[PDB]
Amino acid sequence: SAAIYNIDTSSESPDHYLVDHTLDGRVLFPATGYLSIVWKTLARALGLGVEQLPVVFEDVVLHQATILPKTGTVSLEVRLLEASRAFEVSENGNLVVSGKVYQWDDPDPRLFDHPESPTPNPTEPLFLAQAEVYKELRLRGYDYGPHFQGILEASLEGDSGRLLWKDNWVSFMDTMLQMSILGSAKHGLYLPTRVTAIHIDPATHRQKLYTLQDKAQVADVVVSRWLRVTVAGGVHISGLHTESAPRRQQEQQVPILEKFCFTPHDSPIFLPVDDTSFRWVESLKGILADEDSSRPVWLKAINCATSGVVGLVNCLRREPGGNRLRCVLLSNLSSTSHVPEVDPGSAELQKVLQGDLVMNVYRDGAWGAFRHFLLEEDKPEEPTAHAFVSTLTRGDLSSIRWVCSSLRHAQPTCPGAQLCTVYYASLNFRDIMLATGKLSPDAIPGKWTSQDSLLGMEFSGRDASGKRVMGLVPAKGLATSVLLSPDFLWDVPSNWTLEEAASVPVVYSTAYYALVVRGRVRPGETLLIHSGSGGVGQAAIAIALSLGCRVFTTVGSAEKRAYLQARFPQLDSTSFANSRDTSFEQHVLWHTGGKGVDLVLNSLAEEKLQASVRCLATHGRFLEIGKFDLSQNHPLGMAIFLKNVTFHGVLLDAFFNESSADWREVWALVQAGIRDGVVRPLKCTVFHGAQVEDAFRYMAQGKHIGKVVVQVLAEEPEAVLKGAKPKLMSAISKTFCPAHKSYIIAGGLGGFGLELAQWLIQRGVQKLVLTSRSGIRTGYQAKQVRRWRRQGVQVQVSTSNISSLEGARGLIAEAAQLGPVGGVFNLAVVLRDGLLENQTPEFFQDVCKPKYSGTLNLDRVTREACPELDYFVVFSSVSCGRGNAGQSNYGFANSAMERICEKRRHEGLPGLAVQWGAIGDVGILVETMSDTIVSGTLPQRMASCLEVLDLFLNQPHMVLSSFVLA
Amino acid sequence: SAAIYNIDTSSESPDHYLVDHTLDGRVLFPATGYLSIVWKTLARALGLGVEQLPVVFEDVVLHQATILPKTGTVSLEVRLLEASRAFEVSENGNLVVSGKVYQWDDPDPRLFDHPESPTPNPTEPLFLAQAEVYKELRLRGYDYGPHFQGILEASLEGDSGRLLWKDNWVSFMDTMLQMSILGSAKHGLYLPTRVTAIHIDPATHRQKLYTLQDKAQVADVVVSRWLRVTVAGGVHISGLHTESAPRRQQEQQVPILEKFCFTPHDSPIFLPVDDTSFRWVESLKGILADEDSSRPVWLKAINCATSGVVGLVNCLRREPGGNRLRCVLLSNLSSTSHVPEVDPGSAELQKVLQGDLVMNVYRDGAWGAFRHFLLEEDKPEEPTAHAFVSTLTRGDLSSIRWVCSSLRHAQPTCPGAQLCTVYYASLNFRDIMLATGKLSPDAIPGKWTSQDSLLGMEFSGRDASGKRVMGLVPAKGLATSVLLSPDFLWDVPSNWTLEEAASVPVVYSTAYYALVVRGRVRPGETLLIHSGSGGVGQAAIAIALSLGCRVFTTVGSAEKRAYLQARFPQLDSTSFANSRDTSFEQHVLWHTGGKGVDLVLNSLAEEKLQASVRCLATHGRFLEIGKFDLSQNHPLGMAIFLKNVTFHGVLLDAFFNESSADWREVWALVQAGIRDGVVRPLKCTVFHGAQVEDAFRYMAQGKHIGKVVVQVLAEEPEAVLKGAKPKLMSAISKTFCPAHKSYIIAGGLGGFGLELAQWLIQRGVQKLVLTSRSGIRTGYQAKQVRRWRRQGVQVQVSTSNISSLEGARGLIAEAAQLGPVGGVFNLAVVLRDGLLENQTPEFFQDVCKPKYSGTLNLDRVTREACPELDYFVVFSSVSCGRGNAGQSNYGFANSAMERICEKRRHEGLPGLAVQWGAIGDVGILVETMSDTIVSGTLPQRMASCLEVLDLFLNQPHMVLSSFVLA
Ligand SMILES: NC(=O)C1=CN([C@@H]2O[C@H](COP(=O)(O)OP(=O)(O)OC[C@H]3O[C@@H](n4cnc5c(N)ncnc54)[C@H](OP(=O)(O)O)[C@@H]3O)[C@@H](O)[C@H]2O)C=CC1
């Protein structure tokens, strides 16, 4: 009865294509693989083939992921309950997939009709090609191989496209899921966990498939987020639910990060490489012709201080004969104008020749070279008044640090939002779940970036005017300051303390919303509060006892029983039950006469929830404030509703999305309970802001009673202190940008350009000027730019070529039109590869014009008319630091950029040259070349690249490098 | 994997004991049989025995009953999903049982600890013996055989007892269920359909079993209705849910009903049988000694007119020599005193001897006999102003008739209750479900007797003062008059009609409760009403459009669409969707922007409910007014509550149990909607009261739009008609009794006595006087009497022996102390069996004293001091009409009783002699003897006996008989 499927991903195995279903570097069994396997089991059970068996899956739950090992075989057992229409996929006795499967008796082709789009697509010519679709997906973390790369075309919105049919149901339905998650605003690796219904009718699937000019069978796919339905061919997927799988910390991208600083130490053929027309390149070719007399080739850069022949020599030494030519450079790169220029016709040149160093650089009287050093692993910390608590690595409370917040680098001022100095910030159970990784950051409603830390949901402190307030925030409450609407603030009473007030907002708002607004608790109603020792439980007890309600509370220990007895003397011995067992059901049903309770404020889970449901009386109100059974879609028997029972799903976090008068009702309830003495501060276990990690691991164990409070600022003795400024603490430096400043990315439409632009928007950039010679051509560029514009960012796609000084001047002009120029990023690149033999001075000019001349002009115009500039970053290559075969012009342009940035930083101006190794997921190496070893180094992924760039932007080093070794 | 169990109930089969699990004459597979079978499957799967496998069943659902045929074998397949802990019992591919089964890993003996009783048991000596327990159960319809008769002792409350252990888990757990349903107030056959949890730990089961003096292993069982838990031995059953299985109409008890009326036409040994000392019995023995001269044995009854030697001769003729003796009787039973007595010493005796008739009776100048005639099958109909609609046979709309109601024979008058003449009574979907049998009468909340008809939930008419009102009732609304609280009445406005007003109460109260009280609908909220063409749907549309709410309504036809468009012009084309498919989900999610609706008033079922749940918006309120998914305990995925969603189980029928201000809120809402014009009468399809069956079958098909209304009384033109009396219609006569009258059952503590007493309480008897020589001795008697007393009936257990005239006088005195004597029932009997040879005059005296002398004295004292007497019933035997071997004194006493009743009826006084055949389930034949053929006749069951008695009490025949032939 148990159909066995030995999934082998060996080369000769029929299931070898499954190696291409790689998700975060792990070969996982697709959910559609389970669908096909259960389909095959049902077809054998009915004595048919899958192609002759139209099938319906219902309530498919994916309980765990099956990892397909590189060597071995995974055995999946499918058992069918035909009478109950159920199936079960298990692996080694562990339930993998459950749900209902049955033959579609009357298959309706009209089901597989594409739903109309809510809005017509204006950019019909602009779509996502297959390479673009899977570049975006691999950016999200889906490393789909060729067998699972079945999306040829997709619209920019991600609601329509085409899927190639390789006579494979697993791949086709997986590409269905890929197209479903392609038009997703949420970022990260989202995996299917539930599907409400899947109808596969292979008969109409054969009809829906059509052949293109490529002779490849394809099918139109449509995703409707309004109807929650994906249709393609003869497959219909309704109610697909995906949860964000936390990306594994065992990432092989541990980049080598390095620093580039000037470090003091036959017949010679001298070549002046200082000419701006690159006419010497052909001359260098002549020097490469000879063998004996070409041993002392001395290329000297005397005139220009930012010539950058270092990368030239580094790249030419790798060419055949480069070492034999012994290319030795003399770079007179004087950082300051007061330093005397070394005469190359004097004894200094003879001394340099006697030294025979591969590279000689003169810097302010020092004759040295350019060497690579290891970058310090200590994270840059700065003294700021605006910081937040964040877990650097998810799931690890040890990696809990204060990081500079977006309020430090961008101070906002607008009505309807108030900046309050946080003196005390309360931990909540959701904060513990976030910091321990048990809860995904995306599960919290709101617009949160990937780098955003959502720790902290409630605080107390002082507003801008100095008034002593306490506030409730959706997130970012565990900070030195909070930007929140004044609608979520209460005045702290005179008798209260800020320490005390920090425990009221979340807990009492939740209790008031649940009991009064939702539960509509009336005086004298019997009521069961679960975990009455906790914050929300204690508040619910206070509210109920203010109304003279009989309270049955469940506590997990006798000490919590004693605390609740002392705190609420209205509770008697029969008020208390166990929360760690189901016996609270028996206690309640006995002490209530078998009737039940009028309300159940429930945070318990699984069977403990079901027992809580069995504690309900007639007309009982079950207020579910827990999330586990809700998030797991656990079944609730509906017979309880025969008791006139109301079931509330109570989520206070819904009040931060609309903030209408519905929240003001709960606010007024809390304020009234404050003035009536009903709302009373809970017990607060206080950890100082210097040790927030200990607060987290303390509250994680659960021995706490009441509220854990992190004191960010000690409450000074005063009612309304006019200052109200946060004290300066050392927090990890993080790159953030003012919303009033404009930021330019020259070459911002490229792979790294678009990724950097998105990263900058995530860092507060609101005015972007991306420059490209050709403008927006690809559908990926259009989708990214239109998404940023819809998000509210002024993204200008400029054509102003920075190669010309007039072009850079006009570019700075269009940037300043939006706002003062805060940053410029030189990512413009053109490539004219090839060895020195087949190299042209025109090729050198073409390659250096975006980099050499581009950075010349950017530096000049920023010096002239950019007083508020904070960032001057250029993207150089590792081919500059070490050298690449047949990339001499690339290295020369990159070294010129580095010299420019060093010269800028020497005068105190912002300057940064990032030597990037092989860049992954996007760029020129991804398009031209193919996780392939390039020059001994792996392509660094974007996530790692942006992390390293964030680190580099907070360093004092002119030039740093990042590359992942193989 | 599928363990096969071939259940064979043959004599040599190991599962032969299953023949003893008979429920309503059908051998059914016990639910505990499925438990044991799944247990065996799990033990084989784990390679263990059941006795070594502690097991846990969870969420056990019994989807269908398995009938075990007398000849054959039923194959039950058990499949296990060990990974998901599920099991499935199927029969021929049909799901029989589902649920979770798994090994109890850490078995807790403390679980099998008997919960304390809510109240101590005062009557410790008074318990239910095994015979009593199973007599009560077989009265409820559980014909358990000896193998499943494992309850030795049970307390009167039914919450404790002992269960015999026959090394059989099926039988033990079935007796657990029997004891669970023994203390049930609900009557009828209740079968398990769901069990929440079952823990079986055989290890502690062996310890809990103990041996009595009988050397039989037994275990204490405790049922806790407060905790919903039954514990016995090492078995724990929590959350057992039972539904009333409708008793099969294919009942073999089709009694022969008959009438007993006086029908005009060697050496003789004359025996005067008129002596009141029975001294002639021995003389008759002498007449039985001879053979030749004993041929003309002439036993003459001359003095007493109520001698009743007819039964004597009928019983003596069956004795050996009775026919040879040719027992010929001469009964001078003159009905009136003016009739001349026939002289037995004249030519009349010679003529009678020449006729040689077996029996000769002189009645007012007619020389005839007593012959049995067939009773007319036409039900007695009487003209009454108080009738109700009822289905005589459940599930059959053809058997829909008007029956006389309890308001005819008992007119109540008390504050807080009003008697309103019903002019129009509305049918509702629940009424159709009741009359078609799809809905059990017990599913309706309230105190409803077995014979109560619950048809009709709403009416309009006139109150006692004549005011034109409309009312909402829990049941009995389909009547000519309704007794209801004035709290459930509205005044009908002047512009309204009673016809119109009859459609408002149920429909608009439901809509107001759901939308306003429960859903808290706010103006402008999007809202999905299912079946908007129906009554409740139309009312919800009216309420929502009164608030300016956007309405999505689902209708099943285009004609219903057109009707709703014409009726509510605020609905546009996009307001309407299909209710017969799930596509309303797609329509709603499209036309709402994917957000959903704020409310869903749902009456749809199964997947159509789930789609309705998928139509909910954030903070959406799902008001479930349907019952199918609720009653079936269908699963509801809790992920919907992640959307801040509220789920209301809306049941308006809960307002008839408490009737607090919570109902007055809905009442005020309806009244306000009436004065504001929001509440508008629906379309009414009217069937006159003469044809109610056609209204039922019309509304059953579902082509109706609005409300089906039965016009009981045509609305006369007047505002407040002072008369307000219902018109007299012919309704089936039903026995009902005034609450102010006292009723005596002589011998009312016997089997038939207790059953008749319960039947009389169900017919309105509130003052009962049961007489017994020995008083209350058995626990069954105590339980019945205390249940009646707790129900509110004044039950007096008198010892006044009716054999003496003083005793009967005192009995009538204690009866009149409670209230005027409305009825007397002679069920007193003592038996002195044995043939005429071994018969004694003292035996005749003893047997006749409760019957002969008892009815003498009852008749005399009722003639003297019982002017308001309505019933004078005596229970005679079929042994009187035909004759039984060795029961001559019994037949003589029964015939004397019959003569007394005939004499009473001749003077116009109430009189009835019911010749009962073998009586089943209770009585002397059940105790002394054993579905066994007795004298060629089967024992008539109580249900049939009480039905036949109800029929007999409404007849004009002095003596009728009822017996079931074999
Ligand atoms: N890919 C890699 O492995 C490495 C990348 N880098 C750095 O990363 C940056 C981006 O490279 P990559 O990661 O490959 O992503 P891309 O190569 O896709 O982005 C390059 C951008 O440069 C633009 N550009 C080129 N010339 C000009 C010009 N004259 N004016 C305006 N824009 C111009 C291009 O637009 P258009 O041509 O239409 O004008 C393009 O948008 C480069 O600065 C590069 O040095 C460094 C080392 C390695």
Ligand SMILES: NC(=O)C1=CN([C@@H]2O[C@H](COP(=O)(O)OP(=O)(O)OC[C@H]3O[C@@H](n4cnc5c(N)ncnc54)[C@H](OP(=O)(O)O)[C@@H]3O)[C@@H](O)[C@H]2O)C=CC1
């Ligand atoms: N069982 C059958 O098959 C048949 C029954 N019937 C009728 O059904 C009626 C009851 O018989 P049954 O069905 O067996 O149920 P029961 O025999 O159990 O009820 C008989 C009752 O008569 C009582 N009784 C007897 N003598 C007296 C007395 N002197 N004063 C007061 N009460 C007395 C008994 O109480 P106690 O002795 O303590 O006083 C007992 O409660 C009888 O009238 C009988 O004729 C008729 C035909 C067949």
